Amino acid sequence: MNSFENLAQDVNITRSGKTLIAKGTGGRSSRTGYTATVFGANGFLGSYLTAKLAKHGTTVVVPYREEMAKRHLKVTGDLGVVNFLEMDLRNLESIDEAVRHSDIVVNLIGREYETKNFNYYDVHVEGARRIAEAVKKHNIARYIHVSAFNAEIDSPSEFNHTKGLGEQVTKDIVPWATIVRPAPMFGREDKWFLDRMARSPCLVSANKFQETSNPVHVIDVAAALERICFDDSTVAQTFELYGPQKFTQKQIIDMVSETLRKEVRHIELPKALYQAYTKATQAIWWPTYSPDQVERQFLSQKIDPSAKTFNDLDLTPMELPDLMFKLIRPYRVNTFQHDVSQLENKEKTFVHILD
Amino acid sequence: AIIATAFAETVKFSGSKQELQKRTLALYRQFLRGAPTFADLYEVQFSIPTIRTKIRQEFERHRFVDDLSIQNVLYAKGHMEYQECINFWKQQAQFLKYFPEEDDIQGRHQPSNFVDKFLKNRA
Amino acid sequence: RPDAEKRIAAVLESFDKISNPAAITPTASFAKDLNLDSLDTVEVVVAIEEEFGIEIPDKEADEIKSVNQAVEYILAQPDAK
Amino acid sequence: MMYLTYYFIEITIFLAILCTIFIISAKNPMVSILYMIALFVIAAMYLYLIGLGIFSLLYIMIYIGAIAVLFLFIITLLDINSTELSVKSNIRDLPLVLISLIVLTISGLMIYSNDSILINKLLEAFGNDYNTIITQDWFNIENTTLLTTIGNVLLTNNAFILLVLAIVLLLGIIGPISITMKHKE
Amino acid sequence: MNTFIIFIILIPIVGFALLAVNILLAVYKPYNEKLGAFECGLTSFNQTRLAFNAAFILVAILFLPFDLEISTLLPYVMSIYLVSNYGFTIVLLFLLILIIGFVYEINTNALKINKHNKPNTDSLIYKL
Amino acid sequence: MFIGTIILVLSFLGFVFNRRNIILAFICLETMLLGINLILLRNSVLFDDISGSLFAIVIIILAGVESAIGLSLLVSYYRLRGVINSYGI
């Protein structure tokens, strides 16, 4: 039979007073009793999180902006498990509608670039504040907020400045909130790491290829969020999900070109030039490498030791070199066979032109 | 006539355990020799040693069977599966039914004692 | 002869199941040394054939029942003697 | 505006050198065939430049249209392994390559002049400085072009070579059948 | 600058217009299986070529001589008046000699595809 | 005179120093014939002479037949061997 691997029990009481009796063995037609709201479900981590939540019948509310980017989430669950609402952070009624009936709220909202309508502050701080005030008004039992690694109030990068300010306003409005700090997430259809390393015509670094981080698999971060959702041990805590081994970007590019059997191109041109090129390429409409990203190219990961880790969740991550094969083999060309000498005399016995 | 496929074997029920012994060992040899093909055809995310470990596990599952006819049926179905795997008839979805261990850990709470199962209503 | 038993004796201990780590010798029985059981004596000959870049027939792979017979089969230059 | 089209022969010479280097250098021989096609295009250009566009079109329809097609036809059907251009394999050729380049080019430019002293034989080959005067006559009353005259001489003054080329084309049919086909009985 | 020259240069150095329009306007976010190729299908490291019938390559090899024949007839049709009744006989001899090879091609059945798995046509005879 | 000598010499060197292909040998032969024909036609134009153009069109025909026969011979070689390797013709 199937099993509820996410739950420790079947009768679960929330911190708001709701009694949740799990129904079934743990399959598609099963129900945990829980309702959730994942605010960045359309995206990279959010898709995996909603899949893991709706596999067992957690009613996921998905707030969405583009009708077409969300459709792949409806497959993750049975009828009535995944529910869609149209949302904009410039509409408070939307956020209240999204968080009204939920026991778990997850803010995965964040951009790595600034747009005409949303600067880094407007998305990372003010949006977080709006969602957090909704979460406080409706007394939601659990609020789980994702803030990028190396977040710090005053920092060189505006991304980390705004993420730290968000991680402050969340904690000040919602004291029972959990803050999860993921490191650079890699995986399939990743945003800026492996697919980019393997498809890009040329990589660039204002620094050397020398920023150091512990990268982590997106599925394990999603699993950790799943465990944080149902573990009421984790209120008012901070998590630093960073992964087993340390790497530089040069090490990861060497790995990528050893897996890929093709020479990844990198340039290493200076900062004042690349930053201006990036600042110029923000004028096109599609996403490009932002100037604050080449600012972050000089900011290696500083792990907070006071923050919790994976092992508090009884999770052991994978690390990049064992999964790089699985992730990069689609871009492997596989040019030809090995040493076709010793093929001549066996090939001589077959018919090659039929008479 | 209707001719057989590539790696077909006519169904012939041994009247002896000593002949079926040789037949089973040959089939084991063929699976082991074909495991690289199983890793190339099906885009497998794990070792060829892992495939051979799984083959050995599935051959050990029926190691202490002594009824001859049951062993004959098991040999016939094993050869069916070999023909289905070596000839690319299965897809990755059906081939990876044998490999649930290689997929990532299914959640946190996997009971192995009584109180766990009780709290989860599996006792 | 020292071409081949080097790599034979290498793959026989590459095979974990041998209780011993260093009892491998020529004149070692695959079976009554009790290093191996009947499935492992096909696993080992498989490892040997794809060590030497060959494939053994079925009436000579069952006959390779000890490390003597292995080296003497590879001695026929099927490939990578 | 006048001399914008002056160096269009030199450009073709440069592009021909480039395309030959790419033929020698290309990894996949399909790319070598495509660069051979580009070299035929360059030659057809040059032939238009010197006033023989009929030969340019004949080249386009024969070489590119049939011979290159057959090359692509065979490499699409046959396994033709290839070793990539390497420094561990081909760098040994550089001394002899350079010696032969110099010797063969200089002899090919010396062979065209009748002067006795050897150095002057190259110096006359590079003596392309003075322009040709093109005066007009009024004696040609007909509309005879190069193809008309080729036909006239080939069918009257040189009928024998045409009726021998017929047997050459018969070979082109009868040989390949003898070599490729297997007759039952 | 003639209209011929303008057209024959303009077509190539403009033909990539809709190419660029499509590259800039259209989505591009590939999958593994969107980079894939079929419903089912696979092939191990067996070979790089398939066995082909002789006619497949013979049609191409014989295109060359017949094409050269028909292209060598162009001087005649552009010289037909000047070579009056002499070149006519000469090109007729040319065509006859080249028809002999075509006769050979037909009688050998060189462009025919032959079938291996014949249907059995032999009688059923029972030894009594 | 220049383009033809250059194409000829480079094709001859790419024939002689070919450790890669047989297709390159075929290509170098064809480009050698091309170079000869170009020198020939330039002299035909300068002298205002038809014998050069006649010889050139004859070379076109003969090179076509040469290509046909050569690629039939290659096909026989491949009938027997099944792979045309880096070496061994």
Ligand SMILES: NC(=O)C1=CN([C@@H]2O[C@H](COP(=O)(O)OP(=O)(O)OC[C@H]3O[C@@H](n4cnc5c(N)ncnc54)[C@H](OP(=O)(O)O)[C@@H]3O)[C@@H](O)[C@H]2O)C=CC1
């Ligand atoms: N991916 C990584 O490597 C890392 C990510 N993070 C953080 O973790 C989270 C993961 O996001 P990621 O996995 O990167 O995939 P995405 O960053 O693509 O997820 C982005 C989500 O944010 C939503 N969003 C962005 N801006 C707005 C807005 N102004 N109003 C409403 N919704 C908005 C997007 O909605 P739409 O799809 O409609 O735009 C999408 O659902 C983010 O908070 C990110 O900052 C931290 C460290 C590393």
